[PDB]
Amino acid sequence: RKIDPSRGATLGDGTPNDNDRIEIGPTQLAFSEWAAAGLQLPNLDRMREYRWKRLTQAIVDRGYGGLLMFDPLNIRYATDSTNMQLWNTHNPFRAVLLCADGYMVIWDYKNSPFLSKFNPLVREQRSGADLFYFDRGDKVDVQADVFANEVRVLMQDHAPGHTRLAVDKIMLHGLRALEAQGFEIMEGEEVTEKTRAIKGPDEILAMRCASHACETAVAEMEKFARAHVGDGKTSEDDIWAVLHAENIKRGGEWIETRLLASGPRTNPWFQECGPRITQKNEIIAFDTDLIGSYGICVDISRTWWIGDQKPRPDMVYAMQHAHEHIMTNMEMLKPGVMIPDLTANCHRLDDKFQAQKAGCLMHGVGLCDEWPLVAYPDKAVPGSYDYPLEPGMVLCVEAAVGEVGGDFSIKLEDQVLITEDGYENLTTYPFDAALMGLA
Amino acid sequence: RKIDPSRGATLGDGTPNDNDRIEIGPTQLAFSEWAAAGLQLPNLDRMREYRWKRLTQAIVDRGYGGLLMFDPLNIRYATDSTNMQLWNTHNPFRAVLLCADGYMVIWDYKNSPFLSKFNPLVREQRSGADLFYFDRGDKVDVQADVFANEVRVLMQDHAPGHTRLAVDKIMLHGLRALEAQGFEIMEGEEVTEKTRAIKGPDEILAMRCASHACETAVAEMEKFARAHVGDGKTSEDDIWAVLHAENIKRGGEWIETRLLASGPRTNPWFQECGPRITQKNEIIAFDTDLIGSYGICVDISRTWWIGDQKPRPDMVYAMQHAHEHIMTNMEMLKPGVMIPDLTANCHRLDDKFQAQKAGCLMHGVGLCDEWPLVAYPDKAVPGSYDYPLEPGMVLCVEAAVGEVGGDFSIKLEDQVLITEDGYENLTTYPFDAALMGLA
Ligand SMILES: [Fe+3]
Ligand SMILES: [Fe+3]
Ligand SMILES: [Fe+3]
Ligand SMILES: [Fe+3]
């Protein structure tokens, strides 16, 4: 029973054309819009092989025996398998071990070993890596030793002679149990972040699709906002709810922040989306921070003016300054540029906007916000990110622009791929004409 | 400028009646529905004080000097302050120290110290507790020592003589830095889970509101499903998206899982909500797993039959058996009953449903799934939860009922309060009359 009657045994991404399959993914709505937009689809099998090969090599390059992952985003990277991702983020029930020979094992939720079976690179599905008080109460320690012994045996068989085990993050009972087994615990995030920083061809294709779906969802939200803002009942939450639904309808997964705000709640930036009733002749600013189709993060920001009056002149200047900030900074991007040189040479925001500027001028992005973080000169730490940009990295380029004690802020941000030659702005979403000083 | 013209300086929960305030919360939509339903609103101030006093007492009772929290759900319990909750769950940028004398400090996101200022119990807003590779690269270790020295000084001043410091979960760099300051690191979750297990009166009021908002959101989803399932395009994701949007519109926060499935995808249970095109004359089953209004978790499950035909007799039996399971198990609940006695005396599912039954027959709930976990007899571990039920505990009571290799499952679950001399089922959502064999 096909989900897409117009295709053969597989969908355009190589997955089975089967309405009843376990595996989820983009909806027919999403696939339809991508085809209309002329987008080439990723091949998921080749994508999954690329990530696994790259992560395996990262382990080998460091002389480690294995990498043990409890962060659901790292688990997603290694296996492309989801399972209650958001519950998993703060309940560590799940683990993946990847050994130096490429052998990969998942410890999954006891009731659902079938969820990663679609990926043959996952060689075993086990259970019992859930080492936290809710799940095991006063008997965490017993299972921690069972689990740590399993990891020892796997490492003995698939990484013999290696005692170095990289771990991204683990509960203290698990840490103690692994150390008891003889492991020297290495920093797993140094491995995962640097590995994930370079996207293969299929990941870039997935991201193009995710970017399109997100921009479409945002367009629905803009449509809702311009039609309903100022009707005396429409709140920030009402507007933001459109983005939630439109993302989910296209096979997206969640939203990381609550960064949509209206009017004076845009300054200081990082106030959260809430019940505030929106008003005519006001700024609405937001940051998608969105985990979208194929599980790819799309992290873009736009600021809107909605009203019958024109925006104030200080608003227009702020918007122009913000847009100038990200376009100038984006021009720095090409392979071989050292991250601290991005910091040293970035566009300078006016004195009045310096106190409230964003936490970085750029950061990586893939399955969520990722390494590197490109700090502004006054916050940058020498020796923290001494590495060059490379083709296949993706960076979001940020501008947060507002005065201390001001009654609005501008937030703009684009998602940019590093190419062989330089860069490609993936983001095609319009900038507000009125705020840009146009008409 | 009031957000509610009909009230004075405060809203019904005692928060400022101010459309432009920083603090978020339930929307006017939610408040209106609750007022119409005759629900008493929580007093947030009294609620926050209750939690803080109880958490401090927990630290004192154990002979600890303090509790350091990086889990966003624990931070929300201690402070009632949110900040990019979902981003926070897998990016540990945030921390709260609560000392034995009740002194409480938050290290927040550098750019947003203002987010917890509404709670005067939070005595200081700092920054620099973000000890992970994305945020600090190769210089995590330097700040980890800065942060650990700060914790030492606070503990010297507010818990003199104490070397025991409970920690829920911390990055390894943080762990080593704290231990280097002379702290003995204790299990923080044992403190937070047992503290959070007893709800004060305002928390229970808050939960009654969240439950009502959730059931309203679910009713919208049921209306959408019964109207649109079987139209040849409506997908699981389309249906589920209604729950997302209606939650956000009422001031809810997120959904923890993807547990909605249609038809044969309901068996085995734990398949994820996806692109599947729904069909007339099929089961749809779901678990809300919802973080709702006031940040209260509402975790209920229902199973629907949608179609012009009657459900099969085995579907009716399974549904009635599931309903019998949770009503029988619920009837065991009262103060003083020992958790392992719930396990020992629980309703027995038929043999053919035993393999695929849920991971527990009950579990606690508050800001999310919480201690205790009441396991079925064949999984229960002696000595893991040797504790009695107490008034103020809230337990979800569930049933997953499906045969190995079967083409459907039933999922039912209600949310139940322990009272002074028994229990009160908080959940009023209907059971499908056709599946119950009543229609
Ligand atoms: Fe962002
Ligand atoms: Fe960003
Ligand atoms: Fe649940
Ligand atoms: Fe549950």
Short mmCIF file of N, CA and C in Angstrom, two decimals, chain A residues 129-208:
data_model
loop_
_atom_site.label_atom_id
_atom_site.label_comp_id
_atom_site.label_asym_id
_atom_site.label_seq_id
_atom_site.Cartn_x
_atom_site.Cartn_y
_atom_site.Cartn_z
N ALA A 129 20.22 1.02 29.28
CA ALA A 129 21.17 2.11 29.46
C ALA A 129 20.53 3.28 30.19
N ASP A 130 19.36 3.05 30.77
CA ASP A 130 18.60 4.12 31.41
C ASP A 130 18.99 4.26 32.89
N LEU A 131 19.94 5.14 33.17
CA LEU A 131 20.55 5.22 34.49
C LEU A 131 20.13 6.47 35.24
N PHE A 132 18.83 6.62 35.50
CA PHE A 132 18.38 7.81 36.20
C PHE A 132 17.25 7.45 37.17
N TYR A 133 17.04 8.32 38.15
CA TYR A 133 16.22 7.97 39.32
C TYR A 133 14.74 7.68 39.01
N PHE A 134 14.12 8.47 38.14
CA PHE A 134 12.75 8.17 37.73
C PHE A 134 12.62 6.72 37.24
N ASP A 135 13.51 6.30 36.35
CA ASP A 135 13.41 4.99 35.74
C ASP A 135 13.82 3.81 36.64
N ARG A 136 14.72 4.02 37.59
CA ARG A 136 15.23 2.88 38.36
C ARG A 136 15.28 3.08 39.86
N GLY A 137 14.93 4.27 40.32
CA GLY A 137 14.82 4.54 41.75
C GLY A 137 16.13 4.27 42.46
N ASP A 138 16.06 3.56 43.58
CA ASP A 138 17.26 3.29 44.37
C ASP A 138 18.12 2.14 43.82
N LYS A 139 17.78 1.63 42.64
CA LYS A 139 18.58 0.57 42.04
C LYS A 139 19.19 0.97 40.69
N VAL A 140 19.59 2.24 40.58
CA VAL A 140 20.33 2.68 39.40
C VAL A 140 21.69 1.98 39.34
N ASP A 141 22.38 1.93 40.48
CA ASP A 141 23.76 1.44 40.53
C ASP A 141 23.91 0.03 39.97
N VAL A 142 22.95 -0.84 40.28
CA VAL A 142 23.01 -2.22 39.83
C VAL A 142 23.04 -2.29 38.30
N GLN A 143 22.13 -1.56 37.65
CA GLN A 143 22.06 -1.60 36.20
C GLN A 143 23.24 -0.87 35.56
N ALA A 144 23.75 0.16 36.23
CA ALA A 144 24.91 0.89 35.72
C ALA A 144 26.09 -0.05 35.52
N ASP A 145 26.27 -0.99 36.45
CA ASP A 145 27.34 -1.98 36.34
C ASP A 145 27.05 -3.01 35.25
N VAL A 146 25.80 -3.43 35.11
CA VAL A 146 25.42 -4.28 34.00
C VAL A 146 25.75 -3.59 32.67
N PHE A 147 25.36 -2.33 32.56
CA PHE A 147 25.57 -1.57 31.33
C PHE A 147 27.06 -1.38 31.07
N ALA A 148 27.80 -0.96 32.09
CA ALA A 148 29.24 -0.70 31.92
C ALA A 148 30.00 -1.97 31.54
N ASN A 149 29.57 -3.11 32.08
CA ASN A 149 30.17 -4.38 31.68
C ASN A 149 29.87 -4.73 30.23
N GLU A 150 28.65 -4.43 29.77
CA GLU A 150 28.32 -4.65 28.36
C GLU A 150 29.22 -3.81 27.45
N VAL A 151 29.46 -2.56 27.84
CA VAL A 151 30.31 -1.66 27.07
C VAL A 151 31.75 -2.18 27.04
N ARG A 152 32.23 -2.67 28.18
CA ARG A 152 33.56 -3.27 28.25
C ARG A 152 33.69 -4.44 27.28
N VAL A 153 32.72 -5.35 27.29
CA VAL A 153 32.81 -6.51 26.42
C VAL A 153 32.79 -6.10 24.94
N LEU A 154 31.89 -5.18 24.59
CA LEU A 154 31.84 -4.67 23.23
C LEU A 154 33.18 -4.03 22.81
N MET A 155 33.77 -3.24 23.70
CA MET A 155 35.04 -2.59 23.39
C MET A 155 36.20 -3.60 23.32
N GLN A 156 36.13 -4.64 24.14
CA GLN A 156 37.12 -5.72 24.07
C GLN A 156 37.06 -6.41 22.71
N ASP A 157 35.84 -6.61 22.21
CA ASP A 157 35.65 -7.30 20.94
C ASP A 157 35.84 -6.40 19.70
N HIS A 158 35.55 -5.11 19.82
CA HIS A 158 35.55 -4.29 18.62
C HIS A 158 36.54 -3.14 18.67
N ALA A 159 37.17 -2.95 19.82
CA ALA A 159 38.27 -1.99 19.90
C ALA A 159 39.37 -2.48 20.84
N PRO A 160 39.87 -3.71 20.62
CA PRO A 160 40.79 -4.30 21.60
C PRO A 160 42.04 -3.45 21.82
N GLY A 161 42.45 -3.31 23.08
CA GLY A 161 43.63 -2.54 23.41
C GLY A 161 43.36 -1.07 23.68
N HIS A 162 42.17 -0.60 23.33
CA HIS A 162 41.79 0.78 23.61
C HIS A 162 41.10 0.92 24.97
N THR A 163 41.59 1.84 25.80
CA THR A 163 40.93 2.15 27.06
C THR A 163 40.28 3.53 27.01
N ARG A 164 40.55 4.27 25.94
CA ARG A 164 39.98 5.61 25.82
C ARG A 164 38.59 5.55 25.20
N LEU A 165 37.61 5.94 25.99
CA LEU A 165 36.22 5.97 25.57
C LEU A 165 35.69 7.40 25.64
N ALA A 166 35.34 7.96 24.49
CA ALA A 166 34.75 9.29 24.46
C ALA A 166 33.27 9.18 24.84
N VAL A 167 32.80 10.09 25.68
CA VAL A 167 31.39 10.09 26.13
C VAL A 167 30.87 11.53 26.04
N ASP A 168 29.72 11.75 25.41
CA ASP A 168 29.26 13.14 25.29
C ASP A 168 28.76 13.68 26.63
N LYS A 169 27.89 12.93 27.29
CA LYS A 169 27.35 13.32 28.58
C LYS A 169 26.70 12.10 29.21
N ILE A 170 26.94 11.87 30.49
CA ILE A 170 26.45 10.67 31.14
C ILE A 170 26.16 10.97 32.59
N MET A 171 25.12 10.33 33.14
CA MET A 171 24.80 10.44 34.56
C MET A 171 25.95 9.91 35.41
N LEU A 172 26.11 10.47 36.60
CA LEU A 172 27.25 10.16 37.45
C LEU A 172 27.37 8.65 37.76
N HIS A 173 26.25 7.97 38.03
CA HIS A 173 26.28 6.51 38.24
C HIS A 173 26.90 5.78 37.04
N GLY A 174 26.58 6.24 35.83
CA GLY A 174 27.14 5.63 34.63
C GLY A 174 28.62 5.92 34.48
N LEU A 175 29.01 7.15 34.79
CA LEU A 175 30.41 7.55 34.75
C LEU A 175 31.25 6.69 35.70
N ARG A 176 30.78 6.56 36.94
CA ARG A 176 31.51 5.78 37.93
C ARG A 176 31.61 4.33 37.49
N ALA A 177 30.53 3.78 36.94
CA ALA A 177 30.55 2.39 36.51
C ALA A 177 31.52 2.18 35.34
N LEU A 178 31.60 3.13 34.41
CA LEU A 178 32.52 2.96 33.28
C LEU A 178 33.97 3.04 33.74
N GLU A 179 34.26 3.97 34.62
CA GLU A 179 35.59 4.13 35.17
C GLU A 179 36.01 2.90 35.95
N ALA A 180 35.08 2.29 36.64
CA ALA A 180 35.30 1.05 37.34
C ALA A 180 35.68 -0.08 36.40
N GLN A 181 35.24 -0.02 35.17
CA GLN A 181 35.58 -0.98 34.18
C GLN A 181 36.98 -0.72 33.53
N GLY A 182 37.69 0.30 33.94
CA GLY A 182 38.97 0.61 33.36
C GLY A 182 39.06 1.69 32.28
N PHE A 183 37.94 2.25 31.88
CA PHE A 183 37.93 3.24 30.83
C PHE A 183 38.48 4.59 31.26
N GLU A 184 39.25 5.22 30.40
CA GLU A 184 39.56 6.63 30.55
C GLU A 184 38.53 7.41 29.74
N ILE A 185 37.75 8.24 30.41
CA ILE A 185 36.61 8.90 29.78
C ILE A 185 37.06 10.18 29.09
N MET A 186 36.89 10.24 27.77
CA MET A 186 37.31 11.41 27.01
C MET A 186 36.11 12.31 26.67
N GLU A 187 36.39 13.56 26.27
CA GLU A 187 35.33 14.50 25.94
C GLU A 187 34.65 14.14 24.61
N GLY A 188 33.45 13.56 24.69
CA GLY A 188 32.72 13.14 23.51
C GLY A 188 32.26 14.27 22.60
N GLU A 189 31.91 15.42 23.17
CA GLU A 189 31.43 16.56 22.38
C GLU A 189 32.50 17.13 21.44
N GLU A 190 33.76 17.05 21.86
CA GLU A 190 34.83 17.50 20.98
C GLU A 190 34.82 16.65 19.71
N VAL A 191 34.49 15.37 19.85
CA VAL A 191 34.39 14.48 18.71
C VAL A 191 33.14 14.75 17.87
N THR A 192 31.98 14.82 18.52
CA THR A 192 30.72 14.91 17.80
C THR A 192 30.54 16.27 17.12
N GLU A 193 30.90 17.34 17.81
CA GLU A 193 30.71 18.68 17.27
C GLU A 193 31.59 18.89 16.03
N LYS A 194 32.84 18.44 16.09
CA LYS A 194 33.72 18.64 14.94
C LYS A 194 33.34 17.73 13.79
N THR A 195 32.80 16.56 14.10
CA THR A 195 32.36 15.66 13.04
C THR A 195 31.12 16.23 12.32
N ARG A 196 30.16 16.70 13.10
CA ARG A 196 28.89 17.17 12.58
C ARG A 196 29.03 18.49 11.82
N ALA A 197 30.13 19.20 12.07
CA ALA A 197 30.37 20.50 11.47
C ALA A 197 30.50 20.45 9.94
N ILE A 198 30.89 19.30 9.39
CA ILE A 198 31.00 19.18 7.93
C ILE A 198 29.90 18.31 7.35
N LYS A 199 29.01 18.93 6.58
CA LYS A 199 27.89 18.22 5.99
C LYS A 199 28.28 17.57 4.68
N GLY A 200 27.88 16.31 4.49
CA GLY A 200 28.06 15.65 3.21
C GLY A 200 27.03 16.17 2.22
N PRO A 201 27.13 15.71 0.96
CA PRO A 201 26.19 16.16 -0.08
C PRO A 201 24.72 15.90 0.29
N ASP A 202 24.39 14.73 0.81
CA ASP A 202 22.99 14.45 1.12
C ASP A 202 22.46 15.27 2.30
N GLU A 203 23.30 15.55 3.28
CA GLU A 203 22.89 16.41 4.39
C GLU A 203 22.58 17.82 3.90
N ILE A 204 23.36 18.30 2.92
CA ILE A 204 23.10 19.62 2.36
C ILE A 204 21.75 19.62 1.64
N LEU A 205 21.48 18.55 0.89
CA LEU A 205 20.18 18.40 0.23
C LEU A 205 19.03 18.37 1.26
N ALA A 206 19.18 17.56 2.31
CA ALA A 206 18.19 17.54 3.38
C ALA A 206 17.96 18.94 3.93
N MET A 207 19.03 19.70 4.10
CA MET A 207 18.92 21.02 4.71
C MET A 207 18.22 22.02 3.78
N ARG A 208 18.48 21.91 2.48
CA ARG A 208 17.78 22.74 1.51
C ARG A 208 16.27 22.50 1.58
#
